[PDB]
Curated annotation (Swiss-Prot):
GO terms for biological process: apoptotic process; heterophilic cell-cell adhesion via plasma membrane cell adhesion molecules. This is Galectin-7. Could be involved in cell-cell and/or cell-matrix interactions necessary for normal growth control. Pro-apoptotic protein that functions intracellularly upstream of JNK activation and cytochrome c release. A beta-D-galactoside binds at W66, G67, R68, E69, E70, R71, G72. InterPro entries: ConA-like_dom_sf, Galectin-like, Galectin_CRD. Disulfide bonds: none annotated. It comes from Homo sapiens (Human). The gene is LGALS7. It is found in: Cytoplasm; Nucleus; Secreted. Induction: By p53/TP53. Mainly expressed in stratified squamous epithelium.
Length: 132
């Protein structure tokens, strides 16, 4: 479970870059942008590649409740293989890039200014997590 606190929050122009490996027997992993360090904190972005159901879901969470799910085209991950993801913050929302192409655009639901933490967890082998 990787954690990067963002005490001063994030602005348009923030780039989260994640490099890692999906274990041979992965079912799913996630990348969350949370609004606090405490369990149950709202999620501005929840990014959830699911190898077991061959999807990638996007969602937010407010007052403990999940919002409407968005999904991207199939699943640009595959068990046993390295990956690289960028999550890019803009004024409009977050851009998710996998490999060499933008994968999904997730329009802001919560104010970007609320974001205070990055969590990466689940069946993922993490090589590096860098915030630029």
């Amino acid at each position: 479970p990787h954690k990067s606190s963002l005490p001063e929050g994030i602005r348009p122009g923030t780039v989260l870059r994640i490099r890692g490996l999906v274990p041979p027997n992965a079912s799913r992993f996630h990348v969350n942008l949370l609004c606090g360090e405490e369990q149950g904190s709202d999620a501005a972005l929840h990014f959830n590649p699911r190898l077991d159901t061959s999807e990638v879901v996007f969602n937010s969470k407010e007052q403990g409740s999940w919002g409407r799910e968005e999904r991207g085209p199939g699943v640009p991950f595959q068990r046993g293989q390295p990956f690289e993801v960028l999550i890019i913050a803009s004024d409009d929302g977050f851009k998710a890039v996998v490999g060499d192409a933008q994968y999904h655009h997730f329009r802001h639901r919560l104010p970007l200014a609320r974001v205070r933490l990055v969590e990466v967890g689940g069946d993922v082998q993490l090589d590096s997590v860098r915030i630029f």
